[PDB]
Amino acid sequence: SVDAGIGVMGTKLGMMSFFEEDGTVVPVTVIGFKEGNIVTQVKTESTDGYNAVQVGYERLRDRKLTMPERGHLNKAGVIPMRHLQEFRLVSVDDFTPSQKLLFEELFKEGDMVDISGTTIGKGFQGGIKRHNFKRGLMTHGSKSHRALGSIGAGTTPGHVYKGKKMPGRMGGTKTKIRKLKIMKIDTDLRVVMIKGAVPGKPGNLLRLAPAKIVGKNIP
Amino acid sequence: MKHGRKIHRLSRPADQRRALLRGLTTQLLKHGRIKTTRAKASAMRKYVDKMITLAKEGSLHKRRQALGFIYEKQIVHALFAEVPERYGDRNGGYTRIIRTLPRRGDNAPMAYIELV
Amino acid sequence: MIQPQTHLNVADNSGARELMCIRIIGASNRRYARIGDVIVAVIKEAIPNTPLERSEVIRAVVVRTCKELKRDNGMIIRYDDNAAVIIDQEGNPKGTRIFGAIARELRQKFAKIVSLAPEV
Amino acid sequence: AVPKKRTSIYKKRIRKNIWKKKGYWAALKAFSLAKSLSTGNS
RNA sequence: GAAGGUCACGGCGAGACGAGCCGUUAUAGGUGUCAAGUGGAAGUGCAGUGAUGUAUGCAGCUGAGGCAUCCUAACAGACCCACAGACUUGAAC
RNA sequence: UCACAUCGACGGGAAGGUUUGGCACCUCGAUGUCGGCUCUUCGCCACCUGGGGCUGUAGUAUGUUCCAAGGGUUGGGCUGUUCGCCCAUUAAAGCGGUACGUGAGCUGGGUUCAGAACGUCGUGAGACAGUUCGGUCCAUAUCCGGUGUGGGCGUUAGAGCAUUGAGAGGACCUUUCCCUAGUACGAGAGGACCGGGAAGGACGCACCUCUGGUGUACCAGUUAUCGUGCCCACGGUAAACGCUGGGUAGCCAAGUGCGGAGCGGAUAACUGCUGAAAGCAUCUAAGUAGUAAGCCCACCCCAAGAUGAGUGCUCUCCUAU
RNA sequence: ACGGUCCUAAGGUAGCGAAAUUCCUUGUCGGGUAAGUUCCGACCCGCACGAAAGGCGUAACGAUCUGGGCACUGUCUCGGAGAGAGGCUCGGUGAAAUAGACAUGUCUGUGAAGAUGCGGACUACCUGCACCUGGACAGAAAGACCCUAUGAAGCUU
RNA sequence: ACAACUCUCUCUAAGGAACUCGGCAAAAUAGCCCCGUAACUUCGGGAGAAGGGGUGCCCCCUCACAAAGGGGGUCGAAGU
RNA sequence: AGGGUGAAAAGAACCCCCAUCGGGGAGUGAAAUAGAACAUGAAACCGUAAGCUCUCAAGCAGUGGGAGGGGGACCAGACCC
């Protein structure tokens, strides 16, 4: 919950092979940005029950928004945007609304960033692919191949246990990949270069916020 | 799981898919308007448009390229002569999909395809 | 990618002609051993009059593999053969000569192997 | 494999009525198209 | 016909169906082009009795990817929904 | 030397319900018998991993036994086999319950049909938990139960956004190496405690830049024959690529990234401080400190159908419309 | 190998032998394999081989049984991708076995000793669709085992 | 339409029986010509034993070897 | 296995929907709430309409108590859902 800095919204833009003057070949994700990461609302212990900052992203023609959202953004005096996401912090002040978040100035390279985002959707999938089950024999006359085998025990339990692993919808869900190196911040292009992989195909939103180690948070 | 895979199957194998698209393309070219299903129509826009595009550069090579397709010599000779006059202006998109009432004996959705 | 029951050529002149792998050593519950790793092998054939007779369980270390090991450079390296060198116990091989070609990754743990190599 | 008892009544009504509601939805959609049929469409 | 919602219409890295999300004057397709794949077309010239080679030519054919452009289809339109919010106490201009 | 480090005779007393029994209480108008595969879960009487007391504990490595069930507990040869022995490993190769878990999930090698044979018993037909070869394993899920996913309604005027966290899950695993230090210890031989670095293993989460598999979409060669009037050049067929050789996107791993962290809390065995009852002693009766992969917060995902229906921001309340 | 003594019609000759015979038993020894309750050769303690219910050998032949090798591979490590036919959705037609009544939760306790229905707790809006089979001592065939009936029927002396 | 799952199929990096009651299933072999062919044997066999080499397309020597035989060229990763 | 329109075929001219089937008016008849699938027409089973009533529930479904609501063209401390 309580995040170790203010995060920043972002967009995935494929993978690059990034070299260095050693000759270490490094795999990297190009992360682009679209109008803003503008602060919208500030929540407090005073009125709202907790400390937090809401941050929009991605500009629109202001017909595609609804009256209520138009009001909520026009109260802050802000460009039309989707994707208001919160960041619950302990720190509260110096986040007054209509203030742009300089991704360039707020990270500073070699940081190890924690990126969330919704993953690739693999539909309704079987026990094997979903829960890393094994399959039965192929020959020696086995009419079982890919299946769950037995489910439960016998008359004693007399029913199927709750959260028994079964075929279901794998993918299309949020997963924080945490601790990831920032390789380069292109001043020119406004494009962050992060080591490794990141959830979803090119297009997805990403909640880009700093390392959340247990010497940083709340004992 | 069909992620970023774009191909109109038409319920068939590759035997018969190309056989369909070919014959439909021929008949459409001949008559100029046909009635078929939505899927059989909507899939057909890659091949009619490809062949009209092929009829722009009327050369020995391109006529054989097209003539492998149509399986009716005398339609493809109608093109090459016809096309560059009555499509010279138009830059792509030579095909309109009007859409009309399900087929009786299977509630199959239905459409018209014809040259624009 | 050498595993239990894999047949492995010998790259030195300790006498053994061909091996067969029967276990990986070091890092337990390992599926298979790639270049650098030590294995256990039975000798399946040898030249007649050498010390190392047939049908003896002995250690080897894998040096040629058909399954591209990778540098940090980005360069990858296949071979056309799966072949190991018959280690003695800790240090050197039994023979005082190694054949073929072998990688730099080997020289950290096996200094004496890349000493005797022809074309590293 | 096999049913233990019959559903008998009331439950079968509940099951059938949703199926008839499928019909209802189709009726709404077909009603909507009749207005589209009247005027324009180019 | 409120706000909004649901349909329809073009779709999707979303999806068994519903659901989700984007689009409805840059959403899909087409066209133009460019990464990329494959490997040097057809036609003609020349060489050889001929199988064949060879030049025109990183060609020709693809192009599920990116980018450009309204050429085509996003037309036509439908359905649902509003009493400023029962009732009791106590602080407050 | 000394019963009580470690064993413990003759004898005595318990629990457990995994073995072999005794009984014949449910089931003969049927509840499928072993072993294997798949997938569980739970118990502790703890194989290893955490933390201890004693030692006939110099150290290393033990023995013994207390706390602890969070995690883990290999790959083969032989046998139908569970069991067992053996080979190569390893931190270790724990033992049990769940109809000796699981056949409307699978298998049919064993065992309970008919054939046939060997030994044997039988005057004979036939027989023998003696042996041998051969011998048909059903099923479209009504309900509960589960994994997913909608719709309705509810939440007190109706909505669009943002979240709070009751609650609930996933994950907290282990290996050698290096420094400490050849230090402490030890005559030598050997060789630490404590803490800090190392590259792995298994395991999970995500991705396709690299390496590739596939890629009946695409490109290339080539057999047979048919069609395009003929040569040239294409097309069809050779199941649901004729056969090969390549392969973008997608999807995949053998490929790439990431993960396991806390000087946070209360404890278990244990070690204590102060301290009587009992002028002394005593970890306890008052009080209090250290102190575990165990327990609770923290990490990560879900989550107000949390009817206890929370909280915030914002929008809307005209009429036949 | 050599003798003594009893019984009997006579006491197994050749050959073969741990075998389709071997209980004890994975006999022991050697070969084959890193490791071999199966396999090959030898031993003989033949429970209980044996001379036409033949004995022992044998080239060939076997959809014969039983061991080992080479080649070969998704059999497996350890899965992955793709094509068809289904499955899924829409329209048309439209069955079945089953069924005391069904307003048909989990835990532990209870009871014809193994409960959706009885006791105490816990959990849980109402209702579809897709998938899965642990339970309803699920369905199927008045158990084919076991035993009973002064039942039936075959076959033997 | 292009979910799981089942079937009928196609391919698969490294390994190559580690599967399993058992190589069950799949794979591999394959036509023709030439060379070559062991133990044993009832002297008929074993035997297609095993194992090797050549095959496409074009052009040539021959008062008679069913694209022969032999010689020379040419294409493909690959010629039944 | 499969009988019962009516006393009498008087078995429905004509009109409307309409290719047929069948249907509604007309006409016949004591009756067509006797129309040929025709006489009396029970139950299961399938609906349509009205009164009340379920979406924090747990239930062999009743029973004793009975909140709130509804009646029957007949004024009840009565009676019924």
Curated annotation (Swiss-Prot), chain A:
* Protein name, as recorded: Large ribosomal subunit protein uL3c
- Function in brief: Component of the chloroplast ribosome (chloro-ribosome), a dedicated translation machinery responsible for the synthesis of chloroplast genome-encoded proteins, including proteins of the transcription and translation machinery and components of the photosynthetic apparatus.
Keyword set, alphabetical order: Chloroplast, Plastid, Ribonucleoprotein, Ribosomal protein, RNA-binding, rRNA-binding, Transit peptide
Subunit info?
Component of the chloroplast large ribosomal subunit (LSU). Mature 70S chloroplast ribosomes of higher plants consist of a small (30S) and a large (50S) subunit. The 30S small subunit contains 1 molecule of ribosomal RNA (16S rRNA) and 24 different proteins. The 50S large subunit contains 3 rRNA molecules (23S, 5S and 4.5S rRNA) and 33 different proteins.
- Phylogenetic lineage: Eukaryota, Viridiplantae, Streptophyta, Embryophyta, Tracheophyta
Q: Which family, according to the similarity comment? A: Belongs to the universal ribosomal protein uL3 family.
Q: Which GO terms describe its biological process?
A: translation
Quote a single Gene Ontology cellular component term. chloroplast envelope
- Natural source organism: Spinacia oleracea (Spinach)
Ranges for the region named Disordered are 144-172
Where does it primarily localize?
Answer: plastid
UniProtKB/Swiss-Prot annotation, chain B:
Biological processes, Gene Ontology terms: translation
Please indicate if the UniProt record lists Kinase as a keyword.
Answer: no
* One Pfam family, short name: Ribosomal_L17
* Single GO molecular function: rRNA binding
Q: Which UniProt keywords apply?
A: Chloroplast, Plastid, Ribonucleoprotein, Ribosomal protein, RNA-binding, rRNA-binding, Transit peptide
Which superkingdom heads the taxonomic lineage of this protein's source? Answer: Eukaryota
- Which InterPro entries would you find in this protein's record? Ribosomal_bL17, Ribosomal_bL17_sf
Q: Which GO terms describe its cellular component?
A: chloroplast; cytosolic large ribosomal subunit
State the oligomer form and interacting partners.
Component of the chloroplast large ribosomal subunit (LSU). Mature 70S chloroplast ribosomes of higher plants consist of a small (30S) and a large (50S) subunit. The 30S small subunit contains 1 molecule of ribosomal RNA (16S rRNA) and 24 different proteins. The 50S large subunit contains 3 rRNA molecules (23S, 5S and 4.5S rRNA) and 33 different proteins.
Please give the family membership noted in the entry.
Answer: Belongs to the bacterial ribosomal protein bL17 family.
The protein in question is named Large ribosomal subunit protein bL17c
Q: What species does this protein belong to? A: Spinacia oleracea (Spinach)
Taxonomic lineage from the root: Eukaryota, Viridiplantae, Streptophyta, Embryophyta, Tracheophyta
From Swiss-Prot, chain C:
GO cellular-component terms in the record?
chloroplast; cytosolic large ribosomal subunit
Which SMART domains does the record cross-reference, listed alphabetically? Ribosomal_L14
Q: Which PROSITE patterns match?
A: RIBOSOMAL_L14
Cross-referenced SUPFAM superfamilies, in alphabetical order?
A: Ribosomal protein L14
Q: Which UniProt keywords apply?
A: Chloroplast, Plastid, Ribonucleoprotein, Ribosomal protein, RNA-binding, rRNA-binding
**An annotated GO BP:** translation
Annotated coiled-coil segments of the chain: none
Answer whether the UniProt record assigns the keyword Oxidoreductase to this protein.
no
Family note: Belongs to the universal ribosomal protein uL14 family.
Q: What's this protein's function? A: Component of the chloroplast ribosome (chloro-ribosome), a dedicated translation machinery responsible for the synthesis of chloroplast genome-encoded proteins, including proteins of the transcription and translation machinery and components of the photosynthetic apparatus.
NCBIfam families reported for this sequence? rplN_bact (TIGR01067)
Q: How does it assemble?
A: Component of the chloroplast large ribosomal subunit (LSU). Mature 70S chloroplast ribosomes of higher plants consist of a small (30S) and a large (50S) subunit. The 30S small subunit contains 1 molecule of ribosomal RNA (16S rRNA) and 24 different proteins. The 50S large subunit contains 3 rRNA molecules (23S, 5S and 4.5S rRNA) and 33 different proteins.
* Name of this protein: Large ribosomal subunit protein uL14c
Look up and give the organism this protein is from.
Spinacia oleracea (Spinach)
From Swiss-Prot, chain D:
Positions of disulphide bridges: none
Subcellular location, principal: plastid
Q: Tell me which GO cellular component terms the UniProt record holds.
A: chloroplast; large ribosomal subunit
Asked if Chloroplast is a keyword of the record, the answer is: yes
State the UniProt keywords alphabetically: Chloroplast, Plastid, Ribonucleoprotein, Ribosomal protein
Keyword check for Ribosomal protein = yes
Q: Which BP terms does GO give this entry?
A: translation
Where found?
Answer: Plastid, Chloroplast
Its Gene Ontology molecular function terms? Answer: structural constituent of ribosome
The family assignment reads: Belongs to the bacterial ribosomal protein bL32 family.
Role this protein plays: Component of the chloroplast ribosome (chloro-ribosome), a dedicated translation machinery responsible for the synthesis of chloroplast genome-encoded proteins, including proteins of the transcription and translation machinery and components of the photosynthetic apparatus.
Quote the subunit structure annotation: Component of the chloroplast large ribosomal subunit (LSU). Mature 70S chloroplast ribosomes of higher plants consist of a small (30S) and a large (50S) subunit. The 30S small subunit contains 1 molecule of ribosomal RNA (16S rRNA) and 24 different proteins. The 50S large subunit contains 3 rRNA molecules (23S, 5S and 4.5S rRNA) and 33 different proteins.
Could you identify this protein by its name? Large ribosomal subunit protein bL32c
What is the scientific name of the source organism?
Spinacia oleracea (Spinach)
Classification lineage: Eukaryota, Viridiplantae, Streptophyta, Embryophyta, Tracheophyta
This protein's gene is called: rpl32
What range of the intact protein is shown?
Answer: 2 to 43 of 57
